[PDB]
Amino acid sequence: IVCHTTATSPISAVTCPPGENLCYRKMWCDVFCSSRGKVVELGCAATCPSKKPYEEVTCCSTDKCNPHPKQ
Amino acid sequence: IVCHTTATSPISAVTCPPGENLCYRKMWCDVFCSSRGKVVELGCAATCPSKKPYEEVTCCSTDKCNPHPKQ
Amino acid sequence: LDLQMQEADISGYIPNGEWDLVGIPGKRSERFYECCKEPYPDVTFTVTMRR
Amino acid sequence: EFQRKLYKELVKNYNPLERPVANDSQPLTVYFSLSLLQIMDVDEKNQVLTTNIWLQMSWTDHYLQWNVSEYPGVKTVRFPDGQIWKPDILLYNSADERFDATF
Amino acid sequence: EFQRKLYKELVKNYNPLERPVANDSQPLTVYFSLSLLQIMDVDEKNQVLTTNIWLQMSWTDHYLQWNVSEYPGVKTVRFPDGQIWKPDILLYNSADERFDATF
Ligand SMILES: *[C@@H]1O[C@H](CO)[C@@H](O[C@@H]2O[C@H](CO)[C@@H](O[C@@H]3O[C@H](CO)[C@@H](O)[C@H](O[C@H]4O[C@H](CO)[C@@H](O)[C@H](O)[C@@H]4O)[C@@H]3O)[C@H](O)[C@H]2NC(C)=O)[C@H](O)[C@H]1NC(C)=O
Ligand SMILES: *[C@@H]1O[C@H](CO)[C@@H](O[C@@H]2O[C@H](CO)[C@@H](O[C@@H]3O[C@H](CO)[C@@H](O)[C@H](O[C@H]4O[C@H](CO)[C@@H](O)[C@H](O)[C@@H]4O)[C@@H]3O)[C@H](O)[C@H]2NC(C)=O)[C@H](O)[C@H]1NC(C)=O
Ligand SMILES: *[C@@H]1O[C@H](CO)[C@@H](O[C@@H]2O[C@H](CO)[C@@H](O)[C@H](O)[C@H]2NC(C)=O)[C@H](O)[C@H]1NC(C)=O
Ligand SMILES: *[C@@H]1O[C@H](CO)[C@@H](O[C@@H]2O[C@H](CO)[C@@H](O)[C@H](O)[C@H]2NC(C)=O)[C@H](O)[C@H]1NC(C)=O
Numbered sequence: 001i002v003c004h005t006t007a008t009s010p011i012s013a014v015t016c017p018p019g020e021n022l023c024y025r026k027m028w029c030d031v032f033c034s035s036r037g038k039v040v041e042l043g044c045a046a047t048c049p050s051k052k053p054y055e056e057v058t059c060c061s062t063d064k065c066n067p068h069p070k071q
Numbered sequence: 072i073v074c075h076t077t078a079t080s081p082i083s084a085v086t087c088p089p090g091e092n093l094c095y096r097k098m099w100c101d102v103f104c105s106s107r108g109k110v111v112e113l114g115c116a117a118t119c120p121s122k123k124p125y126e127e128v129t130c131c132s133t134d135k136c137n138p139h140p141k142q
Numbered sequence: 143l144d145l146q147m148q149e150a151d152i153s154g155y156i157p158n159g160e161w162d163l164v165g166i167p168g169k170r171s172e173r174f175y176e177c178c179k180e181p182y183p184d185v186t187f188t189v190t191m192r193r
Numbered sequence: 194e195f196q197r198k199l200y201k202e203l204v205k206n207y208n209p210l211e212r213p214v215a216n217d218s219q220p221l222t223v224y225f226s227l228s229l230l231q232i233m234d235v236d237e238k239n240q241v242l243t244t245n246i247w248l249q250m251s252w253t254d255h256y257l258q259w260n261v262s263e264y265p266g267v268k269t270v271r272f273p274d275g276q277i278w279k280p281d282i283l284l285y286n287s288a289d290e291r292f293d294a295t296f
Numbered sequence: 297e298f299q300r301k302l303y304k305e306l307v308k309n310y311n312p313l314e315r316p317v318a319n320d321s322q323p324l325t326v327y328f329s330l331s332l333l334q335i336m337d338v339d340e341k342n343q344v345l346t347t348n349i350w351l352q353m354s355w356t357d358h359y360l361q362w363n364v365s366e367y368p369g370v371k372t373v374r375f376p377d378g379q380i381w382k383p384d385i386l387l388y389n390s391a392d393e394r395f396d397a398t399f
């Protein structure tokens with residue numbers, strides 16, 4: 001499974017380790033949600049994590065299902 | 072009974088619910104009573120409410136008896 | 143100046159240890175005056191907290 | 194290079210007292226929001242709540258517009274306090290002793 | 297003698313709002329570091345850490361360049377706050393009440 005991630009800049013297409021076959025992304029508004037927009041965190045996790053009240057998650061199980069919105 | 076109200080902008084001519092057949096208006100000076108003038112609150116109430124020391128009330132029992140002073 | 147209230151942000155909240163934040167909802171309100179028909183708006187955020 | 198030219202053009206006749214609308218009769222829309230970071234103090238002796246917050250104002254300025262194609266690379270500009278118009282949004286129920294606690 | 301001439305030349309058309317790069321598309325590199333001097337207070341009531349620190353910013357300005365051979369002895373110049381560009385580096389998690397604690 002290959003999941004996009006943000007811990008690497010520029011945005012990478014790192015290939016996920018075993019035990020974690022869900023690419024996920026998490027998005028919320030910070031202060032600068034007027035000009036910059038919502039934040040973006042991409043990764044691969046064991047099972048997709050908890051959604052706080054102010055956080056949104058879109059969880060996939062396929063390769064490159066979590067790209068940056070521009071893409 | 073139809074009573075003017077200010078909770079709707081622009082000033083409306085909402086039709087009052089039952090049990091409340093007194094259109095009222097309440098007016099007092101805030102800080103900006105030099106340029107803007109006194110405040111205006113319009114509505115329909117069961118019986119016209121208490122007048123604080125700094126508040127003035129002009130209570131009617133007829134349709135559209137409480138318009139904005141311009142009108 | 144047509145004020146428009148969009149929602150508050152708690153992503154950065156830092157609990158302090160003496161108050162629990164129930165919420166911080168907002169309300170846009172308007173006030174009319176004798177001088178003219180034009181309304182004067184305002185935005186009120188109500189911080190609710192329990193000890 | 195292009196920055197100098199742009200900054201010159203934008204302040205050629207700009208007035209910071211003028212509400213930036215094309216038609217003076219129509220209103221200017223301002224989106225106002227908030228970002229709380231923590232509760233700092235809840236005094237009952239003086240009846241004062243001390244908070245840490247970042248305001249968020251968003252509006253549109255008609256006079257600060259330019260063509261990106263004519264100024265390649267200059268996608269944004271930044272202006273200090275007294276060089277362009279800001280709205281007079283402030284806390285009615287302030288007890289600060291300077292009345293504008295903002296930076 | 298040469299100082300007067302240099303200071304005149306350097307501020308002939310300088311704008312302190314303009315990021316000082318030759319190509320506006322390329323970025324400006326800023327080296328940011330720190331120097332701690334002591335811990336001043338660690339409050340648990342307000343959850344505030346009070347420190348004494350000196351920041352260290354280092355960048356490169358394209359418009360402030362000169363030939364040493366043409367200005368003998370003038371190896372450096374010094375500019376106050378609002379006469380040249382400085383970056384807007386500041387503490388996001390500040391609780392100071394003036395929000396910029398720097399001198
Ligand atoms: C100068 O800056 C302003 C504001 O920053 C900018 O105008 C804004 O642009 C954004 C992004 O294009 C707009 O946001 C869009 O709004 C529409 C309508 O509400 C939405 O349908 C769009 O949806 C996108 O985002 C969603 C988020 O979940 C995605 O799911 C979706 O797939 C889309 O990608 C998007 O949110 C915004 O409405 C405007 N206006 C304002 C006031 O914010 C302007 O373009 C900038 N100018 C230049 C020249 O860059
Ligand atoms: C520039 O601003 C000034 C001040 O804001 C303004 O002059 C003021 O206008 C108001 C409103 O016209 C005046 O108030 C009036 O005063 C007279 C005499 O005292 C009253 O009879 C009027 O009565 C009205 O309000 C009553 C309130 O209960 C109503 O019951 C009654 O039916 C009337 O509607 C009214 O109060 C005020 O006297 C002047 N001057 C000053 C110093 O306030 C001026 O007109 C503005 N200029 C422009 C071009 O707009
Ligand atoms: C500026 O705004 C005014 C107010 O809307 C415009 O005048 C109005 O024009 C509309 C047509 O869109 C008419 O229906 C109104 O009766 C007009 N009112 C008044 C008081 O004139 C005016 O045309 C606008 N100016 C420009 C240049 O567009
Ligand atoms: C300023 O920077 C831009 C961006 O790099 C330069 O344009 C690029 O030039 C390189 C060649 O080094 C090309 O490979 C890119 O395709 C160009 N991109 C764009 C968007 O034009 C530009 O040449 C630079 N200006 C100067 C004067 O050097």
Ligand SMILES: *[C@@H]1O[C@H](CO)[C@@H](O)[C@H](O)[C@H]1NC(C)=O
Nearest residue numbers: 258259260261262263264265
């Ligand atoms: C300016 O913008 C217009 C579109 O609004 C475009 O046609 C034109 O090419 C731009 N300027 C230049 C120099 O290209």
Ligand SMILES: *[C@@H]1O[C@H](CO)[C@@H](O)[C@H](O)[C@H]1NC(C)=O
Nearest residue numbers: 361362363364365366367368
């Ligand atoms: C200026 O610097 C150049 C080298 O970059 C040098 O050749 C020249 O002599 C210098 N100016 C003078 C007046 O010598």
Ligand SMILES: [Ca+2]
Nearest residue numbers: 234235236237
């Ligand atoms: Ca207390």
Ligand SMILES: [Ca+2]
Nearest residue numbers: 337338339340
């Ligand atoms: Ca302590």
